[PDB]
Amino acid sequence: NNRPEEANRIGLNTTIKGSLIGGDHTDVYTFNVASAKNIDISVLNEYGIGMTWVLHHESDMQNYAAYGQANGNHIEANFNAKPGKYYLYVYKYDNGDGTYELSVK
Ligand code: NA
Numbered sequence: 001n002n003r004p005e006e007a008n009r010i011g012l013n014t015t016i017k018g019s020l021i022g023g024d025h026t027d028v029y030t031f032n033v034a035s036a037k038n039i040d041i042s043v044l045n046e047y048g049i050g051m052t053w054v055l056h057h058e059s060d061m062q063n064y065a066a067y068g069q070a071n072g073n074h075i076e077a078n079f080n081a082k083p084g085k086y087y088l089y090v091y092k093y094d095n096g097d098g099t100y101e102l103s104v105k
């Protein structure tokens, strides 16, 4: 029973570091896509904790527009994004504490 996470507004050419320490298990980002294009979402899992990311287009908060796939410390996807507003959830699912670096290109 708590307030929703405060979404960090970013854009399609972003590199930003975050952390998921203790009870901070989810970070939310939002961005807009003006015209269809492939984008690249990559999260570097610096401490190798149990974390991932999922992405929703505003219009479908159930089916994922994309999701991260772990390749060593790189949790990535590259996919054609239709126009509109997106919500990106970077989150942990185990008891580890770690930092990460998010890129959107
Ligand atoms: Na955080």
Ligand code: NA
Pocket: 005, 024, 025, 026, 027, 028
């Ligand atoms: Na957070």
Ligand code: NA
Pocket: 071, 072, 073, 074
């Ligand atoms: Na690596």
